[PDB]
């Protein structure tokens, strides 16, 4: 009968935006986040990054990007936004001793954009981005 109590933690959750990845289930793979070159919008995130590709394998057929452009190689994302359970109370970090509720903002899915060829007012302009680590 663990009666653990839930803090209605007011620690600002306006910052909290869930990011989803219906992309990377194959081998528990992650982004190894930095890899930054980071670009993000507040509304329709469109997270554009430095998902530079590995190099151990033989050259990864770099002639592909060299056909048009690869300047290592960004594997960027456009956020498939959703309106969803974020406003239910969309919980957060939970120990076995403490429980901190925080109400998030709109969840956004993330997927590669395949750039093979009114947010622009300021939301699309916003990508000055720094994904970084701080125990907080």
């Amino acid at each position: 009968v663990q009666e653990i109590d839930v803090y209605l933690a007011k620690s600002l959750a306006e910052k909290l935006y869930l990011f989803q990845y219906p992309v990377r289930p194959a081998s528990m793979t992650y982004d190894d986040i930095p890899h930054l070159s980071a670009k993000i919008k507040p509304k329709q995130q469109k997270v554009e990054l430095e998902m530079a590709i590995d190099t151990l394998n033989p050259n990864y057929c770099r002639s592909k990007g060299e056909q048009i452009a690869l300047n290592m190689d960004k594997q960027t994302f456009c956020s498939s936004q959703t309106t969803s359970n974020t406003s239910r109370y969309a919980a957060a970090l939970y120990r076995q001793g403490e429980l901190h509720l925080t109400p998030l903002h709109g969840i956004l899915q993330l997927r590669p954009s395949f750039s093979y060829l009114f947010l622009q007012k300021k939301h699309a302009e916003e990508p000055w981005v720094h994904l970084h680590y701080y125990g907080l």
């Binding site: 394998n57 592909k64 093979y116």
Partner: peptide, 25 residues
């Protein structure tokens, strides 16, 4: 798994290795 696309060849002539179309990996 790079850009979520398909696989193409066997390539067993050399070894197991690939050049996924449009996912340059």
């Amino acid at each position: 798994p790079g850009c979520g696309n398909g696989l193409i060849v066997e390539e067993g002539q050399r070894c197991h290795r690939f050049s996924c179309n449009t996912c340059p990996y």
